[PDB]
């Protein structure tokens, strides 16, 4: 359990490596779904709750649209996977090896700097208000309705203007 968050952030890194190699967007879309789920777990692991569940829900919706767009406008006869092309496969394996190497070397030079494999799990949660009640992340987000209304004004305007923008872009 002391390796739990490092494992998750390590899985997240692999997901972005897979996305960066850009196979067919079908598998790119899947890569973001898995990374989104892993990202939700990391937010949860640091004491989050609302933020982790939001980003997964938003990305579940986002990649469903991308799936629909992919089958219409970004498809070929032979969609590529990570294994299809030896060159992409090699850089996937080499990228994972270079991750193990980069973490291994940085552990050696500093030991407590960016990588501190000896102290994993000791520096996740720093302070916690033990007897508190109103502490969950949803309370913080809800300040858009009371104390940070400007944040919600700009967010609302961008979604509203986005409707007019996409209608203009898409008309013939």
């Amino acid at each position: 359990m002391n390796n739990y968050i490092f494992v998750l952030s390590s899985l997240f890194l692999v997901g972005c490596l897979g996305l960066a190699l850009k196979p067919s967007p079908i598998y790119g879309g899947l890569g973001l779904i898995v990374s989104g789920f892993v990202g939700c777990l990391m937010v949860l692991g640091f004491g989050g709750s609302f933020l982790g569940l939001m980003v997964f829900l938003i990305y579940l919706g986002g990649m469903l649209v991308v799936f629909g767009y992919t089958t219409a406008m970004a498809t070929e006869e032979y969609p590529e996977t990570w294994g299809s092309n030896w060159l992409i496969l090699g850089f996937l394996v080499l990228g994972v090896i270079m991750e193990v190497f980069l973490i291994c070397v940085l552990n050696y030079y500093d030991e407590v700097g960016v990588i501190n494999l000896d102290g994993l799990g000791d520096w996740l949660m720093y302070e916690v208000d033990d007897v508190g009640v109103m502490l969950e992340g949803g309370i913080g987000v809800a300040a858009m309705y009371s104390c940070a209304t400007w944040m919600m004004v700009v967010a609302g305007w961008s979604l509203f203007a986005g409707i007019f923008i996409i209608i203009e872009i898409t008309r013939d």
């Binding site: 579940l60 919706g61 469903l64 089958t71």
Partner: protein, 318 residues
């Protein structure tokens, strides 16, 4: 002991699913002036087990054009997610007590569409691709209003915790103050479960079998098991949200018995609806949701923000 509790949730739910296949076939039969299964076991009560054993003894398809990883993953993901939706359900005490259990349901249910999308794509056949693209349209149709409908209801609950809904309804069904949202919620759960009149991703009269057309044998059974498990889940959810079963701290089993009765009834209306109506056209489902439900859902969300303020009826945080 926690492992025993997992068994006493999963196994009864899987038996309930199996016998819903029997109940559906008999209820549909009798509404059609037929009997339905009455030979394989007494009154057909072994028919589900025969169908299960037949399917898992059948050769499973390995089609040549298929992308095999997603082909196998999709039905596996389908049953996993269907079973996972049950763990936070309070009947009246859940196996897993979640602070944001409603948001857990939406996220898990929203990941469930990808089993349809990937199976249809991975099969690499035209009728399966048609079924996958109807799932894309289906989710766009109903997911736009399902969370806002839930939002308005939970402004009387005061939280996303499922167990709090029991206390919210201690003196009254949430149906009474929220029946217009309950109606729209009920139609949404039909679409969410790909049930008639919105059984479009399979729609056998049009796409032969849609997303699962290339699937045989045991892999096919997983999609079927996942669909029938979800029907029970969504109606049990409707029961806890709007039809608050009677709760007494010293008689928990009274809640469970009342919950089952209402959940059984809501599952029966799903089968009753299937026997009664024709199918929507999948563009018409989108217009139903976006041009009828969505305007009213937005107005009612505004009304349910307005209500607790002007009646001083804000529910407690805790």
């Amino acid at each position: 002991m926690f492992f025993i509790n997992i068994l006493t949730l999963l196994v009864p739910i899987l038996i309930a699913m199996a016998f819903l296949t029997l109940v559906e076939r008999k209820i549909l039969g009798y509404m059609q002036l037929r009997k339905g299964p009455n030979i394989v076991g007494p009154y057909g009560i072994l028919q589900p087990f025969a169908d299960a054993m037949k399917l898992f003894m059948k050769e499973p398809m390995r089609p040549l054009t298929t992308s095999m990883s997603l082909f196998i993953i999709a039905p596996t993901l389908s049953l996993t997610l269907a079973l996972s939706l049950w763990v936070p359900l309070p009947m009246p005490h859940p196996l897993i007590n979640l602070n944001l259990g409603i948001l857990f349901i939406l996220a898990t249910s929203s990941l469930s569409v990808y089993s349809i999308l990937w199976s249809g794509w991975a099969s690499n056949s035209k009728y399966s691709l048609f079924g996958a693209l109807r799932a894309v349209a289906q989710t766009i149709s109903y997911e736009v209003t399902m969370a806002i409908i839930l939002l308005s209801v939970l402004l009387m609950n005061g939280s996303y915790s499922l167990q709090t809904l029991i206390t919210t309804q201690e003196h009254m069904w949430l149906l009474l103050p929220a029946w217009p949202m309950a109606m729209m919620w009920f139609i949404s759960t039909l679409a969410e479960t790909n049930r008639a009149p919105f059984d479009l991703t399979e729609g056998e009269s049009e796409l032969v079998s849609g997303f699962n057309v290339e699937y045989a044998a045991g892999p096919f059974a997983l999609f079927f098991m996942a669909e029938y498990t979800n029907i029970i889940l969504m109606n049990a959810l409707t029961t806890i949200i709007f039809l608050g079963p009677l709760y007494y701290i010293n008689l928990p089993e009274l809640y469970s018995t009342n919950f089952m009765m209402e959940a059984l009834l809501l599952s029966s209306t799903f089968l009753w609806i299937r026997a009664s109506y024709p199918r929507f056209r999948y563009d018409q489902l989108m217009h139903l949701l976006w041009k009828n439900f969505l305007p009213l859902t937005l107005a009612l969300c505004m009304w349910h923000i307005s209500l607790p303020i002007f009646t001083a009826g804000v529910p407690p945080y805790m």
